[PDB]
Amino acid sequence: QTDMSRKAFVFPKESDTSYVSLKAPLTKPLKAFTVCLHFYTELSSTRGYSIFSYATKRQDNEILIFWSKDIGYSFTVGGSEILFEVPEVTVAPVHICTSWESASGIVEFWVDGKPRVRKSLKKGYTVGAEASIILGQEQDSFGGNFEGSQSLVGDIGNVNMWDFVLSPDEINTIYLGGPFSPNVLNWRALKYEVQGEVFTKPQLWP
């Protein structure tokens, strides 16, 4: 487990080969989760891109966070998709947190510390534990079949995951940088494998 504090993966070219695969000690199938990350890309006005790709062997889009061009953030669980439309997008680094819960299907999407309206997705589902988590690519088989037109170009980091819905006050601390302890995926205790053109650099954002 490597401490990635202050460091980001840099995907500086559009390619289908550059990815990092993140390994989770996930012994339990998820009835709920939170995932937070920073990313920074100019693609938003050019095309869509994968922000966070989680696949199980049953389902290649088991959790996917996707920027869809001229629409905004696609969020999907279990192949069902919900849109958090963003009309005005700016070239600045952006922090997101996204939370889903099976018991209600309530999705919380948060951008730069501001909540979106809570929406319903995949009530009663469960996310499988045996999963491939990939940054930089959108995967259509378990660990592969990326499309370069869906790759990330630029930076991603502070990828942190919990198997529970963070409260709003917790997510506020995350955005401010208060202390927290992720229990599914910890940027401060990252297990990862790097493939292709990916560089680790000091994070650009504060």
In the complex with a copy of itself, the residue whose CB is nearer, 142 or 200, is 200
State yes or no: 60 annotated in a binding site: yes
Half-sphere exposure of 22 (CA within 13 A, CB side): 27
Residues 38-67 touching a copy of itself, rule: CB under 8 A, are: 40-42
150 is in an annotated binding site: yes
The residue with tokens 């959108």 is 138
Residues β-bridged to residue 135: 20
Q: Which is nearer to a copy of itself, 103 or 141 (CB)?
A: 103
d(CA 157, CA 206): 12
**Candidates 37-45, 110-118, 127-135, 139-147; binding stretch for Ca ion (CB under 5 A):** 139-147
Contacts of 206 (CB under 8 A, 6+ apart): none
Indicate whether 147 belongs to the interface with Ca ion (CB under 5 A).
Answer: yes
Q: What is the DSSP letter of 172?
A: H
The answer to whether residue 141 forms part of the interface with Ca ion (CB under 5 A) is no
Dist. CA 81–CA 138, nearest whole Å = 15
What residues line the site for a copy of itself (CB under 8 A)?
1, 3, 5-6, 10, 12-13, 24-28, 40-42, 85, 91-93, 104-106, 108, 113-120, 153-155, 163-164, 167-170, 172-173, 176-186, 188-189, 197, 199, 201-206
